[PDB]
């Protein structure tokens, strides 16, 4: 069997790779051990990456997440939990980056990326980017300076992908 078959990624550092791709389509094609979700503390997968990953699981991710919250309570901003990856991956690592549109501390973005270091290889979006309101260039910088394990970043918008690559170096 063919798992963690990432292809067409641009190498940014020894361990950070990036591709202009839809993360749901990438997960279905690469079959990663871990797909990272851009989660909130209550695992309410409404929009952005979370809404897209949840919709791809036909809401099984939300049902599982609500049961996890009933048992454990909310996550901390900067924290994570490992749940099933359903039809996308073996596991989903739900990571809570700070949501600056909700007035959260951007300093917590490094703590959020540290969760990636517990997994040898991950398919991920840029934490706190998009609907979370942080600058994606800053998120990529924190990612490269924090994550030491193999992270494959999927950036949906070609124009944001080009901006990230062209401004990295």
Swiss-Prot record:
Record's subcellular location: Host endoplasmic reticulum membrane
Topology with respect to the bilayer: Multi-pass membrane protein
Ranges for domain Macro: 3-169
Catalyzed chemical reaction(s): Thiol-dependent hydrolysis of ester, thioester, amide, peptide and isopeptide bonds formed by the C-terminal Gly of ubiquitin (a 76-residue protein attached to proteins as an intracellular targeting signal)
Activity control mechanisms: Inhibited in vitro by GRL-0617.
Assembly information from the UniProt record: May form homohexamers. Interacts with N protein.
Function: Responsible for the cleavages located at the N-terminus of the replicase polyprotein. Participates together with nsp4 in the assembly of virally-induced cytoplasmic double-membrane vesicles necessary for viral replication. Antagonizes innate immune induction of type I interferon by blocking the phosphorylation, dimerization and subsequent nuclear translocation of host IRF3. Also prevents host NF-kappa-B signaling. In addition, PL-PRO possesses a deubiquitinating/deISGylating activity and processes both 'Lys-48'- and 'Lys-63'-linked polyubiquitin chains from cellular substrates.
Protein name (Swiss-Prot/TrEMBL): Papain-like protease nsp3
Organism: Severe acute respiratory syndrome coronavirus 2 (2019-nCoV)
Full-protein residues shown: 1025 to 1191 of 7096
